[PDB]
């Protein structure tokens, strides 16, 4: 759910027209799944959310993805 | 998360103009009706002048305040057409209120009037007719003076006041550039 | 009026608790300030908690 956010936002600016507003809100609706997992586990909302974005977003000088996308 | 679509609102401002328009609607023209207005003074007074009607009644509605100020500017400059302007403002809001539900923006409504006003000046110059300064127009001034007289009376008094009003201006004012002063004409009440 | 027993003891705790909960936001330099409005309608903005209790109007013996 977190990894698909980067792919949905990439197609938002690529598709012209009024659909740009619905595509961006389409990826935001997937953020509720990781948020409920942190609330039911007692973890803070301000903790898990920024750690998931920094794990799946890195700067790699190359086309092939590296490290781990399974986080 | 509080944000709105900015609902049209407006309404009663135009509705209050329709109620005020009907007051001066039947009061305009020589065939109109004469209404009696007495507020607190115990003195019966009947007049069709649109400016006098608004000054003798206390209006709490803010809409009629701007209309009351428009009659004061036309009296000190033009001195006539006080009721006609009121009828044009109220009727114009009726046609503009229907376009609100269609989505017509009020700024374009205001901008569209300025375009029609500039185009009206071109037709106004060709439609008007110039009148000579010669003093032989007294016969023509008789029919012109009756325009304002027939409005405020039953038309029986106009025939009596026709030679008086016409000869009042020509006698005091010789024909030159000069100027005119209405204060020099005395008024006696009996 | 005279009130004794544990009923007046609980009211004194809740009264001091309501006053304490107001000044908990100004504790420490990272804390938050507050505005004190009088009957005139004026106010002030300061981060010092010492001048707050002097200008704060509270009717209570422990206050």
């Amino acid at each position: 759910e977190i990894e698909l956010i980067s792919r949905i936002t990439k197609y938002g600016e690529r598709t012209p027209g009024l659909l740009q507003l619905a595509i961006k809100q389409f990826a935001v609706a997937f953020e509720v799944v990781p948020r409920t997992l942190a609330e039911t586990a007692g973890l803070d909302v301000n903790e898990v959310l920024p750690n998931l974005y920094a794990a799946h977003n890195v700067t790699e000088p190359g086309a092939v993805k590296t490290d781990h996308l399974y986080k | 998360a509080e944000s709105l679509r900015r609902d049209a609102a407006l309404k009663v401002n135009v509705t209050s103009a329709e109620g005020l328009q009907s007051v001066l609607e039947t009061n305009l023209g020589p065939k109109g009706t004469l209404k009696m207005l007495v507020d607190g003074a115990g003195n019966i007074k009947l007049t069709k002048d649109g400016k006098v009607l608004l000054t003798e009644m206390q209006i709490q509605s803010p809409t009629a305040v701007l209309i009351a100020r428009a009659a004061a500017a036309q009296d000190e400059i033009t001195g006539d057409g006080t009721t006609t302007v009121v009828c044009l403002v109220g009727e114009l809001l009726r046609q503009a209120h229907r376009f609100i539900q269609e989505g017509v923006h009020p700024r374009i409504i205001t901008d569209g009037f300025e375009i029609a006003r500039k185009e009206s000046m071109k037709f106004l110059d060709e439609f008007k007719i110039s009148k000579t300064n010669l003093s032989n127009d007294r016969e023509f001034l008789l029919q012109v003076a009756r325009s304002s007289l027939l409005t405020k009376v039953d038309a029986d008094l106009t025939e009596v006041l026709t030679p008086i009003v016409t000869d009042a201006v020509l006698s005091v004012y010789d024909a030159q550039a000069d100027n005119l002063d209405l204060h020099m004409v005395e008024i006696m009440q009996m | 009026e005279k009130i004794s027993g544990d009923d007046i003891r609980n009211q004194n705790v809740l009264a001091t608790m309501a006053v304490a909960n107001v000044v908990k936001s100004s504790l420490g330099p990272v804390g938050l300030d507050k505005m004190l409005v009088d009957d005139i309608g004026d106010f002030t903005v300061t981060n010092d908690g010492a001048t707050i209790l002097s200008l704060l109007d509270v009717q209570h013996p422990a206050g």
Partner: protein, 140 residues
């Protein structure tokens, strides 16, 4: 006195009895349609201005009980024959008889200064009433 005072000041005169309002409302309607030099959206509100100028001849016949639609069609029928000929003839509403009339023969005339400030004056007054979206109540 103030109506005759404007006759000596200004040499221009306009006929009354709705002769100017009917001729102006009809001219402005066909002028923008031929030129089409303003805008497509703007001409929507311009039509409301032309229809708002026809209330004056309809008001004069409304107090007397005459049909405002009947006297409106009789004036438009006379203006169609005047457009074909190259002459100039003014048409106006006669309240006594109920048919049309010649304002030059009847002698109904209105001041130029009064009617010039009436169109411009009523434009700004009626515009400001539509510029207020929400009534502001304050001060107490």
């Amino acid at each position: 006195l103030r109506a005759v005072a404007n006759v000596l000041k200004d040499k221009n005169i306009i006929p009354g009895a709705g002769a100017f309002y009917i001729a102006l409302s009809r001219y402005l309607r066909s002028a923008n349609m031929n030129k089409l030099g303003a805008k497509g959206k703007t001409k929507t509100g311009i039509e409301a201005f032309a229809e708002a100028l026809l209330v004056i001849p309809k008001t004069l016949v409304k107090n007397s009980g005459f049909d405002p639609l009947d006297v409106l069609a009789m004036v438009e029928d006379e203006l169609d024959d005047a457009q074909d000929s190259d002459e100039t003839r003014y048409v106006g509403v006669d309240l006594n008889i109920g048919d049309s009339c010649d304002p030059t023969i009847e002698g109904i005339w209105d001041s130029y200064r009064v009617l010039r400030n009436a169109i411009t004056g009523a434009t700004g007054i009626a515009s400001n009433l539509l510029l207020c979206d929400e009534l502001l109540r304050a001060g107490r």
